[model samples]
Target chain A: QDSLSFGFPTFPSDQKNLIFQGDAQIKNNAVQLTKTDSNGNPVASTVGRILFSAQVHLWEKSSSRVANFQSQFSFSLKSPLSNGADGIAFFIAPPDTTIPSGSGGGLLGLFAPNQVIAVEFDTFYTWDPNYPHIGIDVNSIRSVKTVKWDRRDGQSLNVLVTFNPSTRNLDVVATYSDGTRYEVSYEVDVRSVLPEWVRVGFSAASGEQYQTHTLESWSFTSTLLY
Target chain B: QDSLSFGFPTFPSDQKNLIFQGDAQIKNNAVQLTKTDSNGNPVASTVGRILFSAQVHLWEKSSSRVANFQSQFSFSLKSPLSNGADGIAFFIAPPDTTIPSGSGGGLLGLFAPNQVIAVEFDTFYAQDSNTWDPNYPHIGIDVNSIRSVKTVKWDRRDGQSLNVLVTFNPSTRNLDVVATYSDGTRYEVSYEVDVRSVLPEWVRVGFSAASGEQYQTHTLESWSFTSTLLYT
Candidate 1:
């Protein structure tokens, strides 16, 4: 894996490196993942999936002795009315040349049961009753740990994820509109869960409750630890 | 003048390009213009002045022509208690190398009766009765004369940085300003102004402030501007 960094208010120069699946589309300078069309109309199942992954591997097996990385993005989730369904997530999946698909709604559409590492920002907890929180999932929908997502309605929020190789720790920080912050961390071996090379991106879904998940801005940076 | 731009959570690069007079100091990634010193003490009638200006001309007479420019900044005015005085202003004036001195209370240090164009954030309205004020704390666009050509009442928030964005389009000679408070409240105002008709082609751009009986501190957190010189 090589070091790579990019931010999106505009699509990154590495446009070819971007892989959009399902209903993901670029509109109004942002990546609109699901629930809305170019005109922002709720035209899908009111339930649909949108997965955007980078085609390039963010980390490789042989060189994954210890890897350090940081990713941050601003997102806004809004329902045509209130109580938006499902949620969005930042994920690292094997570069297997295929997009995972599943039942929408609380499943988040892009659920990769045993194939990917997902950090979910789940809004509804219909099936599990453990959501509207940030969850760290290794290989299943069942989260290893979670923290309630406290935020203001209709306001954008920022999320920062950092992995420190020396500590073997992954930390997440969320900052809400009024400057309140929430932090959570987990520890794991990178080489154990991810393949030699893994692609990184975001996935969002809307269930019957229907909401728009928009990634207004995103940036990712990584270092190779040979 | 040519294009110019700068931003700060830190001071500008060329510190020498900054001309500081009276009580201004640089601290915590901002320009603190008053109240943390002896001269800035809250003794009744005590007058203090601080004028910070860029040494270079923003535009020069030799290059007299139409130009477009925009500047944005974040600032805060706070007092040890409540109510600060006198005020602060962003100004464009001749490169005379001297900071105009005057009575502080509401003058804001750089009181160039007829030599500068200033946009004042007046915190105190006790000085002159000629100002057509909508309220005590107001923003006034002034040209040479101490009286503001235009004024708008502004709610001053303590301990919060407020944003001000000002733009001038040479083609339309319109000056537009949008001010946003920390609470997401915003106010906008616009005016048709011909800079060439009242000011020198090349002039210095900077900030000035003063405190009188009331003690307060003014801090400039960030400033960014872009200027495209006109081809005459």
Candidate 2:
């Protein structure tokens, strides 16, 4: 509804606009997207989504048809092995109560049988040939573009995303604890890929093989298009 | 010089103003201050010092004779057990071509036989009889001696990444610090001192650590420092 910029050291508070669906727990000053039970089964077969309830206009008929934005977050994926199944994504989707449903694995729990725009941090390769990489996906599980995610082996990752409407370009830069940097960029029509007003947040999941995804911190700044 | 703000992913680059004295290695994008050899002996029995060579004027003489500053750094101390010998400190000392040398363990390599301003993250208890307690993790502010002017019990979880913030206000002459855990829990303490009396007009700043009879590894994940004069 308005310009939004807030940071989450953790989630779930009256002042917070975050809405979690499926399996998400706000503890340890972080938002844990996927959890494990005593026997190590995922709390949710496919942990789904957490969306900012407030919607932002992608463009306005009377105003600008462009939006410029940036977001930064710190997250970690912990599994017993180097190869963990599935991954997490920062995404933009239509504002609705409809939660996506499907087996997790490579789907990443963002595959709703419909479409959404996502930048995925994929950890495994069971379903896709190119993974343990960063991928930009338009509407499906398949990525339109990808780069190997090799910098931060076992520590938390800091990721930054910037979108310039005028240039119709999106850029992603991620850093490791030791300060190694890796980035990927994409050229796209923002108005076509996202609705006029869209809800944004993060989604993550795990398959039979497991991993725990924790969002340690997040901050977003965006200019309302309308 | 210009209200300095910079981040070091690794050490030993021309663009960086950091100077390492002994046994410090720049690899994996971090400054490993102290490492153990194959037999687990301290690499720098007494590891040395790392400092920003520039001197910071703590205050402006003509105006507000005071300065306020904040620094945040990420670090970890790894050892075979919870009781890692020796420790580390963030300090401000007189600029000198010579780095101080001392035995490790509790000395932490930052102590000269002289004076310095420092906040030490000390891990061992054997050297100081006044501080001899088994539950050894502590935070202390040092003014002119190896003994802490003030000390508080703190926790440094084995090898986990830790975050620390140190803030100073010249008006109050108080140093406040907080350490945050991954779970968001925090431990804090404050110390009062008149810097003008304890330190020179300008001091070189940086960190130092050492390993003694008991060995451990110390690493700096990241660091940022900035300062401002209250008035011109």
Candidate 3:
């Protein structure tokens, strides 16, 4: 396994070693995983993702060494209406991971496509009890743990996710502009869910309602030698 | 003056340490130097500036040392109509520089607010040669007037983001710029100007973009600047 580190202060002016699928587009210098049309009209039933093209070295099977990583991204979520359309998730899935068939509305683009570990920043209420919450999903849309959340549109928030191999805990911390914070932590032995190396990025969708999910900046570092 | 360096890969999530005047706004992470109405509609005749709140030191007199600088920014100008109204500028002006009158249309917000030096990326052509605007969209170095003393063709009107790099040397007093467009083409321009002869030792550094009748939106994706004194 190898160490990996990547950062995008702002989405590059040009699309270069990046991967874009579905409605994802680079606009206003952010990775708009899902966007509204020019006149601020949200296109319905859309699903999109923006990912770094290279696969990350998640673990070394021969050495039984799992990587520890830290990822920080600043983002904003604005829906056309009060009842937000959907939400997005930071995901780590197999290298061959593809969008599943039933992954549109409430699934958050990381569905029966299990064998993935995701930290979801959810807005729309689905089967989950919380209206807005953070979900730690080990292999399903149903969260292993959920943490309540509060945010307003036009407000910027930063999400920091850290994985500790020694403790086998994945911690998610969300910070608001005013310095208020929220967190959700789950004990996840990723080796049980994902393979040796995996792909990582963000996925979002818009259902009957419309919304825009934007990731302003992202920086991630992973150490496999540990 | 001590050396200074700063960068905004993406605008800070919080408005801390930033000065926003007029219509400049932070939208979806980038600095939309000029903004539209709440409903995504453009507001006409608006001028705005977004600056680093602190003063930037240009030079130190006692040490006989001058400050040199390099600045880079990524921007996009998309007008509501076919003809874009105005453009934005990377400016170095007196700490007290404010938006001046007649700075709306083609003045690019750097009017005879004379002690300032600016590099203007203009979208609209104000028919009069008095402004010295080129017929095509262009990048220019404005010394004292809205009129450009030097210019190069800059037709990035398609709304795609472009990155511009500007460098200034105190010894040669030369200003050099290179703008890269979406098509992989690069446009270059240069000028010779002594900063000590123009502005103050301490100045404000920021960007200004304005709108005319056509209603355009100017956005800065990122900004980074570095300055150093000769003695440093």
Fnat values, one per model, are 0.00, 0.00, 0.00
Model 3 over residues A1-226: C-alpha lDDT tens digits? 1454556667744544356877788888888887578875557788888766546767766657788888889888886588776888899987677778878877876684368888887777623455688888887646888888875786778999999988999999999989889998989888888887687889988878767888888877777645
The alpha-carbon RMSD values of the candidates against the true structure, listed in the order shown, are: 18.9, 22.4, 18.5
Ten-residue region with minimum lDDT total, candidate 3 chain B: B9-18
Output the number of the TM-score-best candidate: 3
Isolated chain B TM-score per model: 0.83, 0.86, 0.92
Better of 1 and 3 by lDDT: 3
For model 1, residues A1-226, the per-residue Cα lDDT tens digits are 1333444444422232256777776666677778576567554344332333323333444434555788788887776655666788887776653445554666675564356667778877512465378888776545777777753555788999988877878899988778888777888667677765566777777766766777777776665565
Query: i-RMS values of the candidates, in order?
Result: 17.5, 18.1, 17.5
Worst 10 residues of 2 chain A by lDDT: A8-17
Candidate 2, residues B100-129, lDDT tens digits: the string is 655455677775446488888877765444
Error of 1 at B155 (Å): 0.8
Residue B147 lDDT (model 3): 52
lDDT of 1 at A85: 68
CA-lDDT, candidates in order: 0.64, 0.68, 0.77
